[PDB]
């Protein structure tokens, strides 16, 4: 439900497995996504005890909703490191208070 409401915040799931957050994840994510529009922030958060395909959440805050829509349309179903990425929106206010485990 929240994942279908367009905001400037994009959530990426399934980028890497649980316990597989590496140091280059932020740079690879942000530099590619800069082509949908200006990126303000890139946040990596790992939900403890979550399943392999849900555990690692990568958030991007774009400057504008139009960029975010482009990113969600292009990144959902896209491969990253052999994994099929899931892309959706995230509530801005929840993202900004670090409520990163909703939905």
């Amino acid at each position: 439900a929240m994942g279908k409401c367009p905001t400037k915040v994009v959530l990426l799931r399934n980028m890497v497995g649980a316990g597989e957050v590496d140091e280059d994840l932020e740079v690879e994510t942000k530099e590619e996504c800069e082509k949908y529009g200006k990126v303000g922030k890139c946040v990596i958060f790992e939900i403890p005890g979550a399943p392999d395909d849900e555990a690692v959440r990568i958030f991007l805050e774009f400057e504008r909703v139009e960029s975010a829509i482009k990113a969600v349309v292009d990144l959902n179903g896209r491969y990253f490191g052999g994994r099929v990425v899931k892309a959706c929106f995230y509530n801005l206010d929840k993202f900004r208070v670090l409520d990163l485990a909703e939905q």
Binding site: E28, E32, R78, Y79, F80, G81, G82
Partner: peptide, 6 residues
Amino acid sequence: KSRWDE
């Protein structure tokens, strides 16, 4: 690797 599309 850039892992995009790989």
